[PDB]
């Protein structure tokens, strides 16, 4: 019998994933993301916009 | 019209089918090829119900009925019975019976005027069959085989009985019933006519292995295919049958 790692089996799996499971999970994720977004929305140095320095080795100690 | 089909790959159509002159019952499984052939041969003339009895696909061998009623065993569940009622019109009365012999399609044969049952049923079952089907019910054996529902087919135009019945036995059933009766085989020599055929007054469905001579026998016996089909053809044009089934 064809193994689970066969090239043909992988091709058929790819078509099934692209044609049916793809759209189904897309709509499912759309609904879940909508719900989660709904419940979630339910000077540079002194402002933080300019990212600065906070607070074994790679080079040889000179 | 006599046609040839198989359920999935099985030629025993009587196991999975049940025809009366007012409804058809078809087993549920996989594809709708069986449903398609049955509806093509019964094009909405009578209702057809895709059903299950006892969670099983042998509805033909588990059920029996006529144009005036339908009969199911006690193992039938209420959802299935509700399905049957909503699928069939009010002009057919459906009853479930608490009988020990649950193989109703194997123990009860029925035409829309008479009936013939296994000699080992109950009295209460006898009167309730006689009431629900509204037919005269008798107690006989065929070919010394107790399963008349399995080893014989019947209609209001004819009857096919076990190929190995004696002449006087055939005459006795003819006198009892009143319908012209001929003994013949189905599905290439099979003895289970009840399981290999399902026959209504205007339609027959046999298995695909049913040979042409025995299909001609079937048509001539039950006046199918309009034409003539008297059974007088069986008597007169006998060369075909004597050659084929010798």
């Amino acid at each position: 019998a064809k193994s689970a790692r066969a090239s043909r089996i992988k091709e058929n799996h790819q078509r099934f994933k692209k044609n049916i499971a793809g759209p189904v999970e897309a709509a499912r994720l759309e609904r879940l993301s909508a719900k989660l977004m709904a419940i979630a929305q339910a000077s540079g140095v002194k402002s933080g916009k300019s990212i600065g320095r906070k607070d074994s080795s790679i080079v040889f100690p000179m | 019209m006599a046609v040839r089909a198989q359920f999935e790959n099985s030629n025993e159509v009587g196991v999975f089918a049940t025809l009366t002159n007012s409804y058809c019952l078809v087993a549920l499984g996989a594809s709708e090829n069986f449903y398609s052939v049955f509806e093509a041969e019964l094009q909405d003339v009578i209702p057809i119900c895709r059903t299950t009895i006892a969670g099983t696909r042998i509805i033909g061998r588990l059920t029996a009925g006529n144009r005036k009623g339908l009969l199911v065993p006690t193992t039938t569940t209420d959802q299935e019975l509700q399905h049957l009622r909503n699928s069939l019109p009010d002009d057919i009365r459906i009853q479930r019976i608490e009988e020990r012999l649950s193989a109703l399609g194997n123990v009860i044969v029925c035409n829309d005027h008479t009936a013939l049952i296994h000699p080992d049923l109950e009295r209460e079952t006898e009167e309730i069959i006689a009431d629900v089907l509204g037919v005269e019910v008798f107690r006989q054996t065929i070919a010394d085989h107790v399963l008349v529902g399995s080893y014989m087919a019947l209609s209001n135009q004819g009857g096919l009985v076990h190929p190995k019945t004696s002449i006087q036995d055939q005459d006795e059933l003819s006198s009892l019933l009143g319908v012209p009766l001929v003994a013949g085989s189905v599905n290439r020599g099979s003895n289970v006519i009840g399981g290999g055929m399902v026959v209504n007054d205007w339609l027959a469905v046999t298995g695909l292995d049913t040979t042409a001579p025995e299909l001609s026998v079937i048509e001539s016996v039950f006046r199918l295919g309009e034409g003539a089909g008297p059974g007088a053809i069986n008597t007169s044009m006998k060369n075909t049958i004597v050659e084929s089934f010798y």
């Binding site: - | 709708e32 003339v45 399905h83 909503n86 209001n156 001929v182 013949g184 006998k238």
Partner: protein
């Protein structure tokens, strides 16, 4: 049923390569000189044996797969005898058998010598000798292997002709219309070309008449020659003409189209009538569309009538181009076969003692119809939609959608979801598709 199940017969080189590869690869091939002498002996003895059983299995398969000419129906027996030179066939099989015996003897002798061997070199030489002696034997059996391969292919391609079945055997002279009639009557592909010996073998097709299955056998074509001096292909037809209970259809052409005189056809018939000893004999005159029967000299008309006034040989007329009477010839000849066969069956069943046979009782039981003594009929209610209904045809454009086409369009076989509530007849049709309360 057939002879297509003959396994391929190798050539000598292929057989040698197969047997030696097999004993090389399926069996260990690594021994060392420092091992026990008993182990060395066992190793080489096992090698020689395994080779012997491989050869014996192959040769036995060859000998037992091919049919034995003794137990066939003499139709098939004579057909094989004329088509394969049964003498050469049997001597080839005998050479295979004696080679099998020689190989098994060589194996036994060399196993004994190996038993009494005393060194690894001796064992190796004894193995080499045994396996090479068996090879020389095969190289001797080069040619019979080729002959057996050829006959195997020809038998695998031979048609299935049932000796005892209701048969229409069409014979006659080259270019009378046998192949044309065969293609016009059945669906077997028999070549039709205007040259002499187009059909050079036996062809078979099948027919349906009164729900019985009939055989039809097209023969090559016989030529005015005393049987002893005929060709092989010609004898293929004569064996068919001889060992088949059938209706012989001898084709004569009223017109001189074929190339042989009407006197020549009349001659051949009178010559092979002993072949048509008791088979049902029908002469059919074809090519009426070019020369009708009435357009002849009354002298030949009267010779034909004199042939008619003899036995139960029957003259029919047909035309394998306009198909004017092919169906009529079919009907008449097949009906006569059917009635003759049922008659002989009834006679065979009717014993002298007067006791009806069991099979005859059974067929009478299957023929008898049982009817009520009173003779009263029973009323049935056929709905008028049945009589005013239109038959289903799968090629019609405006058919009805139908459940199988519905599932095919809306999915596949294990995909479509069947809606079981669509046929529910309720009071309010909106109440459909409702979860029915069940427990409380």
């Amino acid at each position: 049923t057939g002879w297509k199940d003959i396994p391929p017969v190798p050539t000598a080189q292929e057989f040698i390569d197969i047997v030696l590869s097999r004993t090389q690869r399926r069996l260990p091939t690594q021994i060392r000189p420092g091992f026990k002498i008993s182990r060395i002996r066992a190793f080489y003895t096992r090698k020689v044996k395994f080779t012997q059983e491989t050869c014996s299995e192959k040769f036995g398969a060859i000998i037992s797969s091919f049919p034995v000419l003794s137990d066939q129906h003499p139709f098939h027996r004579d057909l094989m005898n004329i088509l394969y030179d049964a003498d050469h066939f049997k001597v080839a099989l005998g050479q295979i058998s004696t080679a099998k015996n020689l190989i098994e003897t060589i194996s036994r002798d060399y196993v004994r010598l190996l038993k009494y061997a005393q060194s690894l070199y001796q064992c190796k030489q004894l193995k080499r000798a045994a396996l090479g002696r068996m090879a020389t034997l095969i190289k001797r059996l080069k040619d019979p292997l080729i002959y057996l391969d050829q006959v195997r292919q020809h038998l695998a391609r031979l048609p299935d002709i049932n000796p005892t079945t209701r048969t229409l055997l069409v014979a006659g002279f080259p270019n009378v219309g046998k192949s044309s009639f065969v293609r016009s009557v059945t669906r077997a592909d028999t070549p039709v070309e205007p040259y002499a010996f187009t059909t050079k073998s036996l062809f078979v097709g099948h027919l349906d008449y009164k729900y019985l299955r009939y055989q039809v056998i097209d023969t090559p074509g016989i030529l005015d020659h005393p049987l002893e001096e005929m060709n092989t292909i010609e004898m293929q037809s004569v064996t068919a003409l001889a060992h088949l209970r059938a209706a012989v259809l001898y084709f004569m052409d009223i017109s001189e189209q074929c190339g042989f005189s009407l006197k020549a056809q009349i001659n051949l018939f009178k010559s092979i009538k002993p072949l048509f000893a008791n088979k049902m004999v029908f002469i059919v005159l074809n090519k009426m569309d070019i020369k009708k029967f009435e357009e002849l000299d009354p002298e030949m008309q009267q010779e034909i009538n004199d042939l008619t006034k003899s036995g139960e040989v029957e003259i029919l007329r047909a035309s394998c181009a306009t198909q004017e009477g092919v169906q009529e010839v079919k009907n008449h000849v097949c009906e006569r076969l059917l009635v003759e066969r049922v008659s002989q069956k009834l006679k065979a069943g009717t014993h002298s003692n007067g006791n009806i046979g069991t099979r005859l009782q059974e067929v009478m039981a299957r023929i008898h119809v049982a009817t009520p003594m009173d003779g009263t009929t029973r009323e049935t209610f056929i709905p008028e939609a049945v009589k005013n209904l239109k038959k289903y045809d799968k090629n019609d454009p405006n058919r009805r959608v139908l459940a199988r086409d519905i599932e095919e369009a809306n999915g596949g076989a294990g995909v479509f979801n069947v809606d079981l509530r669509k046929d529910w007849i309720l009071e309010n049709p909106e109440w459909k598709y409702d979860k029915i309360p069940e427990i409380f």
